[PDB]
Structure formats: structure tokens, C-alpha cells
Amino acid sequence: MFSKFFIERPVFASVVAIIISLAGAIGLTNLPIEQYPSLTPPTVKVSATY
């Protein structure tokens, strides 16, 4: 019956499709571009001199 509701209401069905796309297009823009996730161990370097 769920699909029926939308089959009656193509404007509603497409408006949900549109907002999803539009929110996801804004999101695509504001995502960071790495090359890999942060999957190398962080590394601290301590240095003394005698």
C-alpha cells in the first residue's frame, strides 16, 4: 500500500527525490577530498642532543 500512496502522488514522490539529490549535491561540495581515509598511524618525534 506504501507504493500506492506515491503512485497517486508523483509530485510528492519526485519532490522527495529532488530534495535528496539537492541535499546530496550540497553535501558532495562540502566533503573533504583525501586520497585515503586517515589510516596511517600518527607519529610523534622526540629529539634530544648530547
Binding site: 506504501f2 507504493s3 500506492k4 503512485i7
Partner: protein, 49 residues
């Protein structure tokens, strides 16, 4: 990489739906397309879930 793998998975549930329209539309030369679509979603809702 996953976005690429998605292309051929993302269309699955939609093409499953649309194949079940040409099939209802072919085996019933009386029904209306709107009524076929309602009937197909009674037939293929459970598997697309």
C-alpha cells in the same frame, strides 16, 4: 570505488520494478498502466525490501 560498485546495484530494485510492468502489460491487454504499476508493487515490494 564503492560509488562505482553502486552504479550496477543502485539500479536493481528499479529495473526489477520496470521489468514487472512490461510483463504485466504484455500478459494483460486490458489493464491500465497506473493499475499495472499498483499491481506490480504488490508483486515485487517484498523482494525489493
Amino acid at each position: 570505488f564503492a560509488l562505482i560498485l553502486a552504479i550496477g546495484i543502485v539500479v536493481d530494485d528499479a529495473i526489477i520494478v520496470v521489468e514487472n510492468i512490461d510483463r504485466i502489460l504484455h500478459e494483460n491487454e486490458q489493464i491500465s498502466v497506473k493499475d499495472a504499476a499498483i499491481q506490480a508493487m504488490q508483486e515485487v515490494s517484498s523482494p525489493v525490501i
